């Protein structure tokens, strides 16, 4: 039919408005700033209490306690400061992906190849961490988990969709609209109202949680995207793929605006974070290490590397004081 | 240096012991990995037997735990990484169909070939023999239909083997994996082909014993022997 | 939920001996560092003994040291205090204390109903400085205290605790810090300070505040209450 035909060429005169909106590149204006400098930080913490892989963590808003999720079935609780485990709470599946700490810190969440997300209350009278609930609609297994507040979440799973939960009638609000691949990764903006994920099918989509469907879709990556996160203002985003390619794509312009890859590293990319004021681009390879890129400049700022196997997962504190990674070694190292 | 902060530091070696011991008792049992398409009985493959996400079974041979996990749920390019550390891969196949053995080659390549999947060995199960020998003896259905190969095809001559005409059959199925298994891996993992009919019983004894073997090189390659 | 009744009192001869236990129900008992905690008929709280989750810590009283015995029993929930040659000053009442300490855990929470025991015939000073505080409900009323020594740690924290007792019940736990409030109860209650000087302060009195206020150190081992600021309605 025609409707093929229609959208291919509604498709090409998107192309054709992003081209006529790029007048310029970010590294034409961005070349008159002195860099950064050589930045080597310095591992402070390992966390040593994992006996498996570990696949998620998630920093609180304190700066501290920051839960963790290994495939020997347990979430790990860390007091960051002491390297003090505060609580271990046992999985009923072994197969978790991800973990999600609540913004209040009365609460936690798990999820993976069960389908299911759990979330686990912590401040109890009994004085123990119990199932506080369990969500149960997804069709395929969970890949990431975001808390709104103590009430909603949303998550995104391997059956190509994403969610938003209630927690206390347990049942999903709105299913938004599916993409044509696996969803492996999504991104919260600091307002709450808007949220990207980045699919299998190399392309991320900005949600709105309100209206409930897509707003924007971006492309440029040529393999699975694996990791995204927002800038701190909210106005810019960044994915990592399995191109060993990061892209900063930009909201107010639908148009890509930086690539950063090095002929050097050809292997995927895991887990992407920005600092606190946006400069540096904090990116976990499969080649066993991390590296800090300038996100304006778009070179290798530096290298954090003494991890043994493949980093799986990276996170920031709020205040930016430190950046705590995980791997398949077992370990959570702790650096600034 | 306070008396909560060394109650606490107390309690954290309380939450340190119990973790030890907890993975102590999951490193005593053994796991498997099953997988296999439709229409080849893999959930019948062991008669010995949590069903939300990925289907358990626990069997017990001569007091050795093996859990098997089946995902069920294509898209098996992605789950594929949380599996990369298991004992072994069982590969179940149908050998009675001929028109989806070249889906099952392909899907055993990609298997065999995967980034995660480096150091795991594959116990291969070429499940329905009989119904491979009757289809064979009805003569309605040739190999050389789909695999030209087997009319320059001879069994060989050191064989172990029924009619002759079946035992080439099943010689030619099996040597199609090993000779792709064997392109590749360069001694870092090796399969273990099984010929295995639809009322078995002795599949778990031969999943045993290539876990032993398994064990046997996973220890040799650690002292430096292999 | 959380219940802890105890019992084992009642007139025991000067020099005897006697079993007090307590049994818990409604948590995980195991989880928990438990105390025995004394007060006299007409003085204070005085804390005596406590063990802790696993029984690997173990602190005594320096007046009762020898003497008394605390022990735990995990998988029927109980807690044992086996004390020997008593003297005449151990005639008092007996509360069952369930405490944990995690980086954000509120200890001293929970207190049991007591036992009554008679019998025939350095440290902080943990100061009050006000018997009792003659008010009208309505208003609003800071109690001070202080201590000898100063309560401020260099990890930030500051170990004072706030604990009201009400007449014919058992103590609870108002404050545990200067200002982290307590679960269930009101924000009309405060507390602030500085190293060694401390204010509560309640905006508004009903008439359940009627009571008597304790300010509690916890810096290091030895467990010291104050004297109790008496509030009442008038």
């Known amino acids: 039919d025609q409707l093929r035909q229609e959208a291919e060429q509604l498709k090409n005169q998107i192309r054709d408005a992003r081209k006529a909106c790029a007048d310029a590149t970010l590294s034409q204006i961005t070349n008159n700033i002195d860099p950064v400098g050589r930045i080597q930080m310095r591992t402070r913490r390992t966390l040593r209490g994992h006996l498996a892989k570990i696949y998620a963590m998630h920093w609180g808003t304190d700066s501290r306690l920051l839960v963790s999720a290994s495939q020997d079935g347990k979430l790990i609780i860390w007091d960051s400061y002491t390297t003090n485990k505060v609580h271990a709470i046992p999985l009923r599946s072994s197969w978790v992906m991800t973990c999600a700490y609540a913004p209040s810190g009365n609460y936690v969440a798990c999820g993976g190849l069960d389908n299911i997300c759990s979330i686990y209350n912590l401040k109890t009278r009994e004085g123990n961490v119990r199932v506080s609930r369990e969500l149960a609609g997804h069709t395929g297994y969970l890949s990431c988990c975001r808390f709104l507040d103590d009430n909603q979440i949303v998550t995104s799973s391997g059956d190509t969709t994403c969610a938003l939960w209630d927690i206390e009638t347990g049942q999903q609000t709105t299913t938004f609209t599916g993409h044509t691949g696996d969803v492996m990764s999504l991104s919260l903006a600091p307002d709450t109202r808007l949220f990207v994920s980045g699919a299998c099918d190399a392309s991320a989509k900005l949600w709105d949680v309100r209206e409930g469907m897509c707003r924007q879709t971006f492309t440029g990556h040529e393999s699975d995207i694996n990791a995204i996160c927002f800038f701190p203002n909210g106005n810019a985003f960044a994915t990592g793929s399995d191109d060993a390619t990061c892209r900063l794509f930009d909201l107010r312009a639908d148009q890509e605006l930086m690539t950063y890859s090095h002929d050097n590293i050809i292997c995927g990319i895991t887990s992407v974070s920005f600092s606190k004021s946006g400069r540096l681009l904090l990116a976990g390879y499969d080649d066993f290490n991390c590296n800090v890129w300038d996100a304006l400049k778009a070179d290798r700022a530096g290298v954090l590397a003494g991890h043994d196997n493949r980093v799986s997962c990276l996170g920031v504190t709020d205040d930016g004081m430190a950046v705590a990674t995980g791997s398949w070694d077992s370990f959570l190292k702790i650096w600034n | 240096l306070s008396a909560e902060d060394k109650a606490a530091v107390e309690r954290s070696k309380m939450i340190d012991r119990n973790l030890r011991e907890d993975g102590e008792k999951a490193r005593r049992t053994l796991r498997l990995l099953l997988l296999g398409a439709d229409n080849s009985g893999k959930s019948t493959i062991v008669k010995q037997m949590h069903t939300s996400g990925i289907f358990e079974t626990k069997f017990q041979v001569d007091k050795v735990n093996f859990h098997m996990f089946d995902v069920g749920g294509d898209e098996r390019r992605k789950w594929i990484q949380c599996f990369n550390d298991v004992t072994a891969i069982i590969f179940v196949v149908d050998s009675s169909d001929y028109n989806r053995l070249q889906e099952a080659l392909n899907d055993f390549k990609s298997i065999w070939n995967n980034r995660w999947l480096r150091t795991i060995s594959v116990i291969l199960f070429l499940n329905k023999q009989d119904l491979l020998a009757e289809k064979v003896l009805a003569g309605k259905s040739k190999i050389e239909d789909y695999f030209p190969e087997f009319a320059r095809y001879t069994t060989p001559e050191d064989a172990t083997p029924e009619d002759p005409r079946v035992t080439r059959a099943k010689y030619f199925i099996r040597k199609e994996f090993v000779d792709i298994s064997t392109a590749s891996g360069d001694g870092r993992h090796i399969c273990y082909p099984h010929f295995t009919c639809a009322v078995d019983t002795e599949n778990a004894r031969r999943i045993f014993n290539d876990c032993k073997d398994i064990i046997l090189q996973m220890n040799l390659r650690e002292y430096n022997l292999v | 939920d959380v219940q802890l009744v105890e019992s084992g009192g009642g007139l025991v001869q000067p020099g005897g001996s006697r079993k007090l236990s307590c049994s818990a129900s409604?948590?995980?008992?195991?989880?928990?560092?438990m105390h025995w905690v004394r007060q006299a008929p007409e003085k204070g709280l005085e804390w005596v003994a406590y063990?802790?989750?696993?029984?690997?810590?173990?602190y005594y009283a320096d007046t009762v040291k020898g003497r008394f015995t605390i022990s735990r029993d995990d998988p029927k929930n109980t807690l044992f205090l086996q004390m020997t040659s008593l003297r005449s000053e151990d005639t008092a009442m007996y509360y069952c204390?369930?405490?944990?300490?995690?980086?954000?855990?509120?200890?001293?929470?929970?207190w049991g109903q007591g036992t009554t025991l008679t019998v025939s015939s350095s440290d902080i000073v943990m100061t009050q400085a006000t018997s009792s505080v003659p008010v009208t409900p309505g208003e609003s009323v800071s109690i001070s205290c202080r201590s000898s020594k100063s309560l401020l740690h260099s990890n930030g924290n500051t170990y004072l605790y706030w604990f009201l007792q009400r007449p014919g019940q058992s103590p609870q736990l108002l404050i545990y810090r200067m200002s982290n409030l307590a679960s269930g109860v009101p924000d009309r209650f405060s507390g602030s300070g500085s190293g060694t000087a401390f204010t509560l302060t309640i905006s508004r009195l009903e008439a359940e505040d009627v009571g008597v206020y304790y300010c509690?150190?916890?810096?290091?081992?030895?467990?010291?209450f104050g004297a109790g600021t008496k509030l009442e309605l008038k």
């Open positions: 204390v369930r405490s944990i300490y995690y980086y954000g855990s509120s200890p001293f929470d929970f």
């Open positions: 063990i802790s989750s696993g029984s690997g810590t173990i």
């Open positions: 409604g948590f995980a008992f195991s989880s928990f560092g």
């Open positions: 509690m150190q916890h810096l290091e081992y030895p467990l010291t």
